[PDB]
Amino acid sequence: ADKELKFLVVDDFSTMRRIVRNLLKELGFNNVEEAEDGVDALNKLQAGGYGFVISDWNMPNMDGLELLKTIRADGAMSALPVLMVTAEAKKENIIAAAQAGASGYVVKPFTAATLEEKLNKIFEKLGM
Amino acid sequence: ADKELKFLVVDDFSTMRRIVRNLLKELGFNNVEEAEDGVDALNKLQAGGYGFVISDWNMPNMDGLELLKTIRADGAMSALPVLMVTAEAKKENIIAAAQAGASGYVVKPFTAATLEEKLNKIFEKLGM
Amino acid sequence: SIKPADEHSAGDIIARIGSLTRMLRDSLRELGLDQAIAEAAEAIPDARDRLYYVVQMTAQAAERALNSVEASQPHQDQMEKSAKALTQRWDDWFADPIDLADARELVTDTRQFLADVPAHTSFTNAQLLKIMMAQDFQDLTGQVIKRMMDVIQEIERQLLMVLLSQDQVDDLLDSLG
Amino acid sequence: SIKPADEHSAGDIIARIGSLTRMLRDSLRELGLDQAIAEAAEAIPDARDRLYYVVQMTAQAAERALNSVEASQPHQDQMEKSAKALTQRWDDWFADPIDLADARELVTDTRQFLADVPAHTSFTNAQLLKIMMAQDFQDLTGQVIKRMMDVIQEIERQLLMVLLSQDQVDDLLDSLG
Ligand code: BEF
Ligand code: BEF
Ligand SMILES: [Mg+2]
Ligand SMILES: [Mg+2]
């Protein structure tokens, strides 16, 4: 994928946004921005430029599933890739986010190997 | 001090025994042993060889103050140096351990600089 | 023991505690707070797992890195004494009587060092990923304190009413999709 | 709404809750458990500090090291490309037409590298002490879960009765001694 691709890492825990930032830095993606919740995330997606989003599920103000359906329902961001990186593991929630239009799903704790594995599986089906 | 000096690091938390082991390794003392409580500590002091003890206060089976008075009261270990490294900070406990016959007192969290500072202040007054 | 007389017997006091006992048992039993104080008392058996979880993750992600720092120091060490070893060798060749022989052996040995640096430098740089990655425990250990603080809040109002893998996740999405 | 008649009014039901209410208020008030359920409800205001403490230490000792790993990578990086830079320069001098000039400049530049290694290697080895030392939070964050689990145990039996610096430490020891 184009190394200038703009990413939006959304999660309520600092520890976890920084751990994903670095992981992306190792992969060559240095144009990354942070968000602490669904709302703040949409606020930045409003500014424009983003082409890839990695989000968590459990977050205040507007959870991940709400942010997923919001992007999938907005006419100007509907196809924006969205990779889920959360702690939820109930087949019922995996499905739920799956049907909501999730690009990919990564359960925490995850390996650096697993993130790259699902970041590419997403670039593969979207011919990015 | 003689670099072969045998140390006995006593504390109920692994994290904290390993952090003191290393700190002593940087200072050149590689003859160090661990203990998880007052009793197990006395069990090793029974085996013989020890010339320096660093202990915590709050521990199961036999706390630090109990281990301090036990060594100070035993005829064969009475003068054994005992440096306290604990989390207790109430002037009332500092005094208590002080009157019990504590060689030194270090409050957690402590700096590597502080440990060496009080390890030498102990070797100084005992002409070690 | 002479004054007075009609004084409560040991039984009469106990007899009374019993009345207040049944009275209690039944105000709760009827107002349905026999319920409440039982949803909070059976939450304790759980929160003890969540607080013993946070200590699991803690004693792990704390021994993990402590293990990297453990294995990264040897390489920073070795790689540094060698650079210092050679910096010396050279200063001498260049100060002592010319000896073309030693001049060769010195070039050979530093081209070797130059070759080993990567092995050490990489490894050490791979342990820093261990230390990083491995710390994820905060976010995790953090959301459990998130929840376990919400529980300690119910157990609070319940005494206020009464007193005022990643391989399976793909087997799923891929087997149903 | 025709059958029957002598049926409890809205007031009569409320009237009754009140009786069970006072009855409750008073069984507790007399058996002295008005006390108990009040020592446990006022423990909650505390444990929320201890669980917000464990998250302080967590978000710290987790950003601390994450900061070392942050600053140690640049040096493992630089020190490694240079060794690789020179290993190349040399392979070429030794394969290409002899050029005594370059032979000098190559020796000068690697004796330089040999000199910088320590600066990097040390620093990186000093950050590993940051990462180590800094982790002390487990023992600490651990003893608070030690205590906070003992408290959640009382709050349990209280619903079982009802339902069955280092600069100051020296100013001290040295000013009184
Ligand atoms: F907070 Be995420 F759902 F792990
Ligand atoms: F457990 Be020790 F008293 F810090
Ligand atoms: Mg979250
Ligand atoms: Mg302790």
Side-chain angles (χ1 to χ4, degrees), chain B residues 8-29:
Chain B
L8 180 56
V9 177
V10 182
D11 189 302
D12 56 296
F13 277 107
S14 44
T15 288
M16 200 57 53
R17 289 194 299 290
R18 222 166 183 170
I19 291 180
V20 168
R21 166 184 291 302
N22 291 71
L23 283 180
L24 296 182
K25 196 186 72 60
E26 269 287 304
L27 298 177
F29 302 110

PDB file of all heavy atoms in Angstrom, chain B residues 8-29:
ATOM      1  N   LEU B   8      21.372 -11.125  51.400  1.00  0.00           N
ATOM      2  CA  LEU B   8      20.114 -11.848  51.490  1.00  0.00           C
ATOM      3  C   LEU B   8      18.994 -10.839  51.263  1.00  0.00           C
ATOM      4  O   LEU B   8      18.705 -10.006  52.129  1.00  0.00           O
ATOM      5  CB  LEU B   8      19.957 -12.517  52.857  1.00  0.00           C
ATOM      6  CG  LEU B   8      18.652 -13.301  53.044  1.00  0.00           C
ATOM      7  CD1 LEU B   8      18.495 -14.350  51.953  1.00  0.00           C
ATOM      8  CD2 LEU B   8      18.651 -13.953  54.408  1.00  0.00           C
ATOM      9  N   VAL B   9      18.388 -10.910  50.080  1.00  0.00           N
ATOM     10  CA  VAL B   9      17.299 -10.016  49.702  1.00  0.00           C
ATOM     11  C   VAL B   9      15.964 -10.663  50.033  1.00  0.00           C
ATOM     12  O   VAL B   9      15.584 -11.669  49.432  1.00  0.00           O
ATOM     13  CB  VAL B   9      17.339  -9.698  48.198  1.00  0.00           C
ATOM     14  CG1 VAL B   9      16.158  -8.820  47.814  1.00  0.00           C
ATOM     15  CG2 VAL B   9      18.646  -9.003  47.860  1.00  0.00           C
ATOM     16  N   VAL B  10      15.254 -10.067  50.986  1.00  0.00           N
ATOM     17  CA  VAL B  10      13.970 -10.589  51.429  1.00  0.00           C
ATOM     18  C   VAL B  10      12.798  -9.663  51.129  1.00  0.00           C
ATOM     19  O   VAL B  10      12.745  -8.529  51.607  1.00  0.00           O
ATOM     20  CB  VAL B  10      13.995 -10.869  52.951  1.00  0.00           C
ATOM     21  CG1 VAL B  10      12.674 -11.461  53.402  1.00  0.00           C
ATOM     22  CG2 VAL B  10      15.130 -11.815  53.283  1.00  0.00           C
ATOM     23  N   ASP B  11      11.862 -10.161  50.328  1.00  0.00           N
ATOM     24  CA  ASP B  11      10.655  -9.416  49.971  1.00  0.00           C
ATOM     25  C   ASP B  11       9.645 -10.396  49.352  1.00  0.00           C
ATOM     26  O   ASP B  11      10.034 -11.353  48.672  1.00  0.00           O
ATOM     27  CB  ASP B  11      10.979  -8.294  48.983  1.00  0.00           C
ATOM     28  CG  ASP B  11       9.800  -7.364  48.749  1.00  0.00           C
ATOM     29  OD1 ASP B  11       8.721  -7.840  48.326  1.00  0.00           O
ATOM     30  OD2 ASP B  11       9.950  -6.150  48.992  1.00  0.00           O
ATOM     31  N   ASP B  12       8.356 -10.156  49.593  1.00  0.00           N
ATOM     32  CA  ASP B  12       7.305 -11.033  49.092  1.00  0.00           C
ATOM     33  C   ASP B  12       6.967 -10.864  47.617  1.00  0.00           C
ATOM     34  O   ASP B  12       6.257 -11.686  47.045  1.00  0.00           O
ATOM     35  CB  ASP B  12       6.034 -10.879  49.945  1.00  0.00           C
ATOM     36  CG  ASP B  12       5.532  -9.445  50.007  1.00  0.00           C
ATOM     37  OD1 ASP B  12       6.249  -8.578  50.544  1.00  0.00           O
ATOM     38  OD2 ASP B  12       4.413  -9.177  49.521  1.00  0.00           O
ATOM     39  N   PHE B  13       7.464  -9.804  46.992  1.00  0.00           N
ATOM     40  CA  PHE B  13       7.186  -9.595  45.574  1.00  0.00           C
ATOM     41  C   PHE B  13       8.396  -9.858  44.674  1.00  0.00           C
ATOM     42  O   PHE B  13       9.449  -9.239  44.831  1.00  0.00           O
ATOM     43  CB  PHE B  13       6.652  -8.175  45.336  1.00  0.00           C
ATOM     44  CG  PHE B  13       5.173  -8.026  45.582  1.00  0.00           C
ATOM     45  CD1 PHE B  13       4.701  -7.361  46.705  1.00  0.00           C
ATOM     46  CD2 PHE B  13       4.251  -8.560  44.691  1.00  0.00           C
ATOM     47  CE1 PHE B  13       3.340  -7.220  46.935  1.00  0.00           C
ATOM     48  CE2 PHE B  13       2.886  -8.423  44.914  1.00  0.00           C
ATOM     49  CZ  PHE B  13       2.431  -7.753  46.038  1.00  0.00           C
ATOM     50  N   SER B  14       8.231 -10.794  43.738  1.00  0.00           N
ATOM     51  CA  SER B  14       9.273 -11.145  42.770  1.00  0.00           C
ATOM     52  C   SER B  14       9.827  -9.864  42.134  1.00  0.00           C
ATOM     53  O   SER B  14      10.998  -9.524  42.311  1.00  0.00           O
ATOM     54  CB  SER B  14       8.680 -12.074  41.705  1.00  0.00           C
ATOM     55  OG  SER B  14       7.403 -11.613  41.282  1.00  0.00           O
ATOM     56  N   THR B  15       8.972  -9.165  41.397  1.00  0.00           N
ATOM     57  CA  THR B  15       9.339  -7.902  40.778  1.00  0.00           C
ATOM     58  C   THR B  15      10.413  -7.195  41.606  1.00  0.00           C
ATOM     59  O   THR B  15      11.502  -6.904  41.116  1.00  0.00           O
ATOM     60  CB  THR B  15       8.095  -6.968  40.685  1.00  0.00           C
ATOM     61  OG1 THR B  15       7.205  -7.464  39.678  1.00  0.00           O
ATOM     62  CG2 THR B  15       8.497  -5.516  40.385  1.00  0.00           C
ATOM     63  N   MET B  16      10.104  -6.961  42.878  1.00  0.00           N
ATOM     64  CA  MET B  16      10.992  -6.245  43.776  1.00  0.00           C
ATOM     65  C   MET B  16      12.259  -6.942  44.257  1.00  0.00           C
ATOM     66  O   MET B  16      13.180  -6.269  44.709  1.00  0.00           O
ATOM     67  CB  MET B  16      10.205  -5.752  44.977  1.00  0.00           C
ATOM     68  CG  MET B  16      10.883  -4.621  45.700  1.00  0.00           C
ATOM     69  SD  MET B  16      11.179  -3.250  44.591  1.00  0.00           S
ATOM     70  CE  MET B  16       9.531  -2.968  43.900  1.00  0.00           C
ATOM     71  N   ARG B  17      12.329  -8.268  44.200  1.00  0.00           N
ATOM     72  CA  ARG B  17      13.567  -8.925  44.615  1.00  0.00           C
ATOM     73  C   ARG B  17      14.533  -8.875  43.440  1.00  0.00           C
ATOM     74  O   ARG B  17      15.737  -8.680  43.611  1.00  0.00           O
ATOM     75  CB  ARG B  17      13.347 -10.386  45.009  1.00  0.00           C
ATOM     76  CG  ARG B  17      12.604 -10.603  46.306  1.00  0.00           C
ATOM     77  CD  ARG B  17      12.747 -12.053  46.768  1.00  0.00           C
ATOM     78  NE  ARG B  17      12.209 -13.028  45.816  1.00  0.00           N
ATOM     79  CZ  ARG B  17      10.915 -13.197  45.550  1.00  0.00           C
ATOM     80  NH1 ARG B  17      10.007 -12.453  46.167  1.00  0.00           N
ATOM     81  NH2 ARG B  17      10.525 -14.109  44.664  1.00  0.00           N
ATOM     82  N   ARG B  18      13.984  -9.046  42.242  1.00  0.00           N
ATOM     83  CA  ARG B  18      14.763  -9.032  41.018  1.00  0.00           C
ATOM     84  C   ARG B  18      15.305  -7.628  40.753  1.00  0.00           C
ATOM     85  O   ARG B  18      16.420  -7.481  40.274  1.00  0.00           O
ATOM     86  CB  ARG B  18      13.893  -9.508  39.863  1.00  0.00           C
ATOM     87  CG  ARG B  18      14.602 -10.439  38.915  1.00  0.00           C
ATOM     88  CD  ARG B  18      13.587 -11.112  38.033  1.00  0.00           C
ATOM     89  NE  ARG B  18      14.178 -12.082  37.121  1.00  0.00           N
ATOM     90  CZ  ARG B  18      13.459 -12.934  36.395  1.00  0.00           C
ATOM     91  NH1 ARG B  18      12.135 -12.930  36.495  1.00  0.00           N
ATOM     92  NH2 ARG B  18      14.052 -13.798  35.578  1.00  0.00           N
ATOM     93  N   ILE B  19      14.525  -6.599  41.066  1.00  0.00           N
ATOM     94  CA  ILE B  19      14.980  -5.224  40.882  1.00  0.00           C
ATOM     95  C   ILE B  19      16.121  -4.879  41.834  1.00  0.00           C
ATOM     96  O   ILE B  19      16.940  -4.021  41.534  1.00  0.00           O
ATOM     97  CB  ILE B  19      13.855  -4.210  41.114  1.00  0.00           C
ATOM     98  CG1 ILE B  19      12.821  -4.324  40.003  1.00  0.00           C
ATOM     99  CG2 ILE B  19      14.425  -2.806  41.198  1.00  0.00           C
ATOM    100  CD1 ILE B  19      11.673  -3.348  40.154  1.00  0.00           C
ATOM    101  N   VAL B  20      16.169  -5.524  42.992  1.00  0.00           N
ATOM    102  CA  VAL B  20      17.245  -5.256  43.935  1.00  0.00           C
ATOM    103  C   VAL B  20      18.442  -6.130  43.605  1.00  0.00           C
ATOM    104  O   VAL B  20      19.584  -5.730  43.835  1.00  0.00           O
ATOM    105  CB  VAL B  20      16.809  -5.504  45.391  1.00  0.00           C
ATOM    106  CG1 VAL B  20      18.016  -5.498  46.310  1.00  0.00           C
ATOM    107  CG2 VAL B  20      15.852  -4.415  45.822  1.00  0.00           C
ATOM    108  N   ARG B  21      18.187  -7.324  43.073  1.00  0.00           N
ATOM    109  CA  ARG B  21      19.279  -8.211  42.698  1.00  0.00           C
ATOM    110  C   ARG B  21      20.125  -7.470  41.667  1.00  0.00           C
ATOM    111  O   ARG B  21      21.329  -7.253  41.863  1.00  0.00           O
ATOM    112  CB  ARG B  21      18.757  -9.502  42.079  1.00  0.00           C
ATOM    113  CG  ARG B  21      19.847 -10.277  41.377  1.00  0.00           C
ATOM    114  CD  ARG B  21      19.313 -11.503  40.690  1.00  0.00           C
ATOM    115  NE  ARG B  21      18.879 -12.503  41.653  1.00  0.00           N
ATOM    116  CZ  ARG B  21      19.669 -13.028  42.584  1.00  0.00           C
ATOM    117  NH1 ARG B  21      20.937 -12.647  42.687  1.00  0.00           N
ATOM    118  NH2 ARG B  21      19.191 -13.950  43.408  1.00  0.00           N
ATOM    119  N   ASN B  22      19.483  -7.081  40.570  1.00  0.00           N
ATOM    120  CA  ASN B  22      20.171  -6.356  39.518  1.00  0.00           C
ATOM    121  C   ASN B  22      20.913  -5.158  40.082  1.00  0.00           C
ATOM    122  O   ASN B  22      22.111  -5.024  39.859  1.00  0.00           O
ATOM    123  CB  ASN B  22      19.192  -5.906  38.438  1.00  0.00           C
ATOM    124  CG  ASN B  22      18.640  -7.065  37.644  1.00  0.00           C
ATOM    125  OD1 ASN B  22      17.838  -7.851  38.141  1.00  0.00           O
ATOM    126  ND2 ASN B  22      19.088  -7.192  36.402  1.00  0.00           N
ATOM    127  N   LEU B  23      20.218  -4.291  40.813  1.00  0.00           N
ATOM    128  CA  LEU B  23      20.874  -3.124  41.402  1.00  0.00           C
ATOM    129  C   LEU B  23      22.169  -3.498  42.118  1.00  0.00           C
ATOM    130  O   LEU B  23      23.139  -2.743  42.087  1.00  0.00           O
ATOM    131  CB  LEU B  23      19.940  -2.397  42.379  1.00  0.00           C
ATOM    132  CG  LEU B  23      18.841  -1.510  41.783  1.00  0.00           C
ATOM    133  CD1 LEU B  23      18.026  -0.888  42.892  1.00  0.00           C
ATOM    134  CD2 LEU B  23      19.467  -0.414  40.947  1.00  0.00           C
ATOM    135  N   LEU B  24      22.185  -4.660  42.764  1.00  0.00           N
ATOM    136  CA  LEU B  24      23.384  -5.110  43.461  1.00  0.00           C
ATOM    137  C   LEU B  24      24.406  -5.661  42.469  1.00  0.00           C
ATOM    138  O   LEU B  24      25.612  -5.591  42.709  1.00  0.00           O
ATOM    139  CB  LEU B  24      23.047  -6.189  44.496  1.00  0.00           C
ATOM    140  CG  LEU B  24      22.157  -5.875  45.707  1.00  0.00           C
ATOM    141  CD1 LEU B  24      22.061  -7.148  46.542  1.00  0.00           C
ATOM    142  CD2 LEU B  24      22.719  -4.716  46.548  1.00  0.00           C
ATOM    143  N   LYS B  25      23.927  -6.213  41.356  1.00  0.00           N
ATOM    144  CA  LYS B  25      24.824  -6.755  40.337  1.00  0.00           C
ATOM    145  C   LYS B  25      25.612  -5.601  39.713  1.00  0.00           C
ATOM    146  O   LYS B  25      26.787  -5.743  39.390  1.00  0.00           O
ATOM    147  CB  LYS B  25      24.032  -7.492  39.249  1.00  0.00           C
ATOM    148  CG  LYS B  25      24.890  -8.406  38.378  1.00  0.00           C
ATOM    149  CD  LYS B  25      24.103  -9.019  37.226  1.00  0.00           C
ATOM    150  CE  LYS B  25      23.784  -7.982  36.162  1.00  0.00           C
ATOM    151  NZ  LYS B  25      25.034  -7.384  35.599  1.00  0.00           N
ATOM    152  N   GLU B  26      24.954  -4.457  39.541  1.00  0.00           N
ATOM    153  CA  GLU B  26      25.607  -3.278  38.979  1.00  0.00           C
ATOM    154  C   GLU B  26      26.670  -2.768  39.941  1.00  0.00           C
ATOM    155  O   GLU B  26      27.644  -2.145  39.529  1.00  0.00           O
ATOM    156  CB  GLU B  26      24.587  -2.163  38.717  1.00  0.00           C
ATOM    157  CG  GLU B  26      23.958  -2.148  37.324  1.00  0.00           C
ATOM    158  CD  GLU B  26      24.924  -1.673  36.250  1.00  0.00           C
ATOM    159  OE1 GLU B  26      25.466  -0.556  36.393  1.00  0.00           O
ATOM    160  OE2 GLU B  26      25.137  -2.405  35.260  1.00  0.00           O
ATOM    161  N   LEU B  27      26.475  -3.033  41.228  1.00  0.00           N
ATOM    162  CA  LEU B  27      27.420  -2.590  42.246  1.00  0.00           C
ATOM    163  C   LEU B  27      28.539  -3.597  42.477  1.00  0.00           C
ATOM    164  O   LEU B  27      29.438  -3.358  43.289  1.00  0.00           O
ATOM    165  CB  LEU B  27      26.695  -2.314  43.563  1.00  0.00           C
ATOM    166  CG  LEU B  27      25.653  -1.198  43.510  1.00  0.00           C
ATOM    167  CD1 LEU B  27      24.959  -1.069  44.855  1.00  0.00           C
ATOM    168  CD2 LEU B  27      26.331   0.102  43.132  1.00  0.00           C
ATOM    169  N   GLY B  28      28.463  -4.727  41.773  1.00  0.00           N
ATOM    170  CA  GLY B  28      29.489  -5.755  41.866  1.00  0.00           C
ATOM    171  C   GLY B  28      29.251  -6.933  42.789  1.00  0.00           C
ATOM    172  O   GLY B  28      30.077  -7.839  42.873  1.00  0.00           O
ATOM    173  N   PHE B  29      28.120  -6.935  43.477  1.00  0.00           N
ATOM    174  CA  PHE B  29      27.813  -8.013  44.405  1.00  0.00           C
ATOM    175  C   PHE B  29      27.009  -9.106  43.720  1.00  0.00           C
ATOM    176  O   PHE B  29      25.801  -8.965  43.531  1.00  0.00           O
ATOM    177  CB  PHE B  29      27.037  -7.453  45.597  1.00  0.00           C
ATOM    178  CG  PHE B  29      27.768  -6.360  46.332  1.00  0.00           C
ATOM    179  CD1 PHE B  29      27.324  -5.044  46.265  1.00  0.00           C
ATOM    180  CD2 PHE B  29      28.920  -6.638  47.062  1.00  0.00           C
ATOM    181  CE1 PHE B  29      28.020  -4.015  46.904  1.00  0.00           C
ATOM    182  CE2 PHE B  29      29.623  -5.610  47.705  1.00  0.00           C
ATOM    183  CZ  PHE B  29      29.169  -4.299  47.626  1.00  0.00           C
TER     184      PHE B  29
END
